[PDB]
From a paper:
Human YEATS domains bind to the acetylated N-terminal tail of histone H3; however, their Kac-binding preferences at the level of the nucleosome are unknown.
We determined the crystal structures of AF9-YEATS complexed with the K5/K8- (1.95 Å resolution) and K8/K12- (2.00 Å resolution) diacetylated H4 peptides. The crystal forms of AF9-YEATS in complex with K5/K8- and K8/K12-diacetylated peptides both belonged to the space group P1, and each asymmetric unit contained two AF9-YEATS molecules (molecules A and B). Molecule B in the H4K5ac/K8ac peptide complex did not bind the peptide at the aromatic cage because the aromatic cage was closed by conformational changes around Y78 in AF9. The electron density of H4K5ac was detected in the H4K5ac/K8ac peptide complex structure, but the position of the side chain of unmodified H4K5 in the H4K8ac/K12ac peptide complex could not be determined because of low electron density. On the other hand, the increase of K1/2 toward K8/K12-diacetylated NCPs was 1.3-fold, which is the lowest among the three multiacetylated NCPs.
Residue numbers in the entry:
A (entry chain A): 1 to 138
B (entry chain C): 4 to 12
């Protein structure tokens, strides 16, 4: 055909962390929350099948799957780590997913609490009509 | 691999 298409979607990855007033019985000093979302409340569920958060092996059931929004994990712990996040798409064509190695860093006690936002742009060259339609609803 | 958990950026 004469025509060609490039579709771009915006994803916001982020996390917040605070030192607890009292640590847990396991010795967890921090509460944190990590998320994947669309910018400005945009509904990425139109094209996102699921988000998988791969937590550190020290956590129980470390593969945390969010099939619906909000795509987030709320936890307590004692240290930060690299947290692989997989965003699966509602498609039957490649790419089926994208991976981000998310930097789930925690600040030291007596430092300001963490509140981080990471901006990612996905580009899809010539997606299927069905997948294009899902992307442009978001 | 091991000892990847840490504090600070």
């Amino acid at each position: 055909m004469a025509s060609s298409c490039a579709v771009q979607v915006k994803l916001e990855l982020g996390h917040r962390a605070q030192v607890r007033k009292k640590p847990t019985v396991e010795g967890f000093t921090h509460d944190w929350m990590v998320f994947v979302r669309g910018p400005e409340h945009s509904n990425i569920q139109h094209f996102v099948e699921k988000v998988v958060f791969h937590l550190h092996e020290s956590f129980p059931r470390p593969k945390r799957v969010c099939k619906d929004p909000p795509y987030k994990v709320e936890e307590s712990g004692y240290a930060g780590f690299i947290l692989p996040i997989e965003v699966y798409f509602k498609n039957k064509e490649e790419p089926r997913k994208v991976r981000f190695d998310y930097d789930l860093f925690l600040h030291l006690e007596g430092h300001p609490p963490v509140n981080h936002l990471r901006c990612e742009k996905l580009t899809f060259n010539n997606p299927t009509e069905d997948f294009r339609r899902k992307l442009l609803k978001a | 691999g091991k000892g990847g958990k840490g504090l600070g950026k």
